[PDB]
Enzyme design. Sequence first.
Site, PDB file in Angstrom:
ATOM      1  N   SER A  28      31.578  65.069  38.853  1.00 24.89           N
ATOM      2  CA  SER A  28      31.783  65.722  37.538  1.00 24.89           C
ATOM      3  C   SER A  28      30.800  65.146  36.522  1.00 24.89           C
ATOM      4  O   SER A  28      30.171  64.103  36.808  1.00 24.89           O
ATOM      5  CB  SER A  28      33.211  65.579  37.072  1.00 24.89           C
ATOM      6  OG  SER A  28      33.611  64.219  37.067  1.00 24.89           O
ATOM      7  N   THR A  88      46.047  66.171  44.640  1.00 19.21           N
ATOM      8  CA  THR A  88      44.795  66.514  45.362  1.00 19.21           C
ATOM      9  C   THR A  88      45.155  67.398  46.555  1.00 19.21           C
ATOM     10  O   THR A  88      46.288  67.281  47.049  1.00 19.21           O
ATOM     11  CB  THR A  88      44.031  65.254  45.785  1.00 19.21           C
ATOM     12  OG1 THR A  88      42.827  65.677  46.428  1.00 19.21           O
ATOM     13  CG2 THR A  88      44.821  64.355  46.710  1.00 19.21           C
ATOM     14  N   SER A  90      42.811  67.392  49.146  1.00 19.75           N
ATOM     15  CA  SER A  90      41.987  66.698  50.179  1.00 19.75           C
ATOM     16  C   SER A  90      42.770  65.540  50.817  1.00 19.75           C
ATOM     17  O   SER A  90      43.140  64.607  50.089  1.00 19.75           O
ATOM     18  CB  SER A  90      40.684  66.207  49.598  1.00 19.75           C
ATOM     19  OG  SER A  90      40.061  65.284  50.481  1.00 19.75           O
ATOM     20  N   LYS A  91      42.978  65.586  52.139  1.00 18.31           N
ATOM     21  CA  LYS A  91      43.656  64.521  52.926  1.00 18.31           C
ATOM     22  C   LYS A  91      42.878  63.209  52.775  1.00 18.31           C
ATOM     23  O   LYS A  91      43.521  62.154  52.661  1.00 18.31           O
ATOM     24  CB  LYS A  91      43.768  64.922  54.403  1.00 18.31           C
ATOM     25  N   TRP A 117      49.147  72.102  41.504  1.00 23.82           N
ATOM     26  CA  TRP A 117      49.995  72.067  40.283  1.00 23.82           C
ATOM     27  C   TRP A 117      51.094  73.138  40.375  1.00 23.82           C
ATOM     28  O   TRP A 117      52.165  72.946  39.767  1.00 23.82           O
ATOM     29  CB  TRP A 117      49.113  72.229  39.040  1.00 23.82           C
ATOM     30  CG  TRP A 117      48.353  73.518  39.033  1.00 23.82           C
ATOM     31  CD1 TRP A 117      47.064  73.725  39.435  1.00 23.82           C
ATOM     32  CD2 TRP A 117      48.853  74.799  38.616  1.00 23.82           C
ATOM     33  NE1 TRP A 117      46.727  75.043  39.297  1.00 23.82           N
ATOM     34  CE2 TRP A 117      47.804  75.729  38.799  1.00 23.82           C
ATOM     35  CE3 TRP A 117      50.075  75.248  38.105  1.00 23.82           C
ATOM     36  CZ2 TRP A 117      47.945  77.077  38.478  1.00 23.82           C
ATOM     37  CZ3 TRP A 117      50.219  76.585  37.806  1.00 23.82           C
ATOM     38  CH2 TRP A 117      49.168  77.482  37.994  1.00 23.82           C
ATOM     39  N   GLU A 118      50.857  74.220  41.127  1.00 25.05           N
ATOM     40  CA  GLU A 118      51.822  75.343  41.288  1.00 25.05           C
ATOM     41  C   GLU A 118      53.161  74.809  41.833  1.00 25.05           C
ATOM     42  O   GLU A 118      54.215  75.335  41.424  1.00 25.05           O
ATOM     43  CB  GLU A 118      51.251  76.427  42.207  1.00 25.05           C
ATOM     44  CG  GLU A 118      50.015  77.111  41.641  1.00 25.05           C
ATOM     45  CD  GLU A 118      48.679  76.586  42.146  1.00 25.05           C
ATOM     46  OE1 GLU A 118      47.736  77.398  42.222  1.00 25.05           O
ATOM     47  OE2 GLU A 118      48.581  75.373  42.470  1.00 25.05           O
ATOM     48  N   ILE A 130      39.941  66.875  35.404  1.00 25.75           N
ATOM     49  CA  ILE A 130      38.459  66.752  35.255  1.00 25.75           C
ATOM     50  C   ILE A 130      37.776  67.562  36.359  1.00 25.75           C
ATOM     51  O   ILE A 130      37.792  67.131  37.514  1.00 25.75           O
ATOM     52  CB  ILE A 130      38.009  65.277  35.224  1.00 25.75           C
ATOM     53  CG1 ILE A 130      38.679  64.502  34.084  1.00 25.75           C
ATOM     54  CG2 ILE A 130      36.490  65.180  35.133  1.00 25.75           C
ATOM     55  CD1 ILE A 130      38.519  63.002  34.195  1.00 25.75           C
ATOM     56  N   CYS A 263      21.442  74.390  38.375  1.00 24.68           N
ATOM     57  CA  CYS A 263      22.404  74.094  37.286  1.00 24.68           C
ATOM     58  C   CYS A 263      21.671  73.404  36.132  1.00 24.68           C
ATOM     59  O   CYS A 263      21.929  73.785  34.981  1.00 24.68           O
ATOM     60  CB  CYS A 263      23.580  73.255  37.769  1.00 24.68           C
ATOM     61  SG  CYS A 263      24.790  74.233  38.695  1.00 24.68           S
TER      62      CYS A 263
END
Length: 286
Positions: A28, A88, A90-91, A117-118, A130, A263
Amino acid sequence: TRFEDIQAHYDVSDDFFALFQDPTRTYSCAYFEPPELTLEEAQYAKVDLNLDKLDLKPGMTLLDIGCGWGTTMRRAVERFDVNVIGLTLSKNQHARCEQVLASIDTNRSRQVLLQGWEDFAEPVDRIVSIEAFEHFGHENYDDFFKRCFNIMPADGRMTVQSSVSYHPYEMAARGKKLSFETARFIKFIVTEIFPGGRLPSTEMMVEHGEKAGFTVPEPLSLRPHYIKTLRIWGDTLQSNKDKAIEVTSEEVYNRYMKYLRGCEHYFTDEMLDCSLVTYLKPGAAA
Ligand SMILES: COc1ccc(C)cc1N
Ligand SMILES: COc1ccc(C)cc1N
């Protein structure tokens, strides 16, 4: 099905990302204040920029939506003496976060959940998110802001840092040539870099927050910091070309050089932005 498979095609090992990121493996925008900070220092500065907006007091619980490798949660425990919950998908990130948080010398609660978050409905004091593509990269903005509003107390606050594009109308205003060119580059990002992703606009981030009941002050633009970040990522990936190709392929190397250089270009031409948006509940401390 097919789509899943076609997308899975663009899965890249964590080892590749390690060859262009700083030692914290932060994926990020860094914060170069002061301008002379190393990328690694600027990544800690970005975490601090986010946490310093949240009015965190000892014994509160901070929710990190998209907790990455646990850097934000650890800094929050150490600096603010708070409990933390990370989400997260990701395992690998889940396992690393559990070890990062267990390592901390503290009696505060530390929890990492392999979920979106759901599926999260526990009371928390403050929220940070972030550049969480896995969480903030698939629309349902109304459900997201409603969930965040409802799980926080009267004085709740949230920061969301996200890359953004402009509405096509605003893009047309700044050259039709450049408008199409940018739209094709966004399509590449959302096909090959963050498959199935959707880049929001600052206006969407603000208006969906307001609809949920949040006060939204002027968003902070991180554009100049992301240009610096992407320049260092690009320069580092290029310096590790042989190692990067060995770990993946020349295809994947060329894809990420196109992404990073691209980018930096569209950020410099002010066709992309990065917004740090603060969401204040009506009872938030003044
Ligand atoms: C945070 O960086 C890491 C993540 C995962 C593993 C296995 C190692 C490191 N250094
Ligand atoms: C900031 O989170 C994101 C990152 C990348 C993409 C394509 C979308 C979102 N929401």
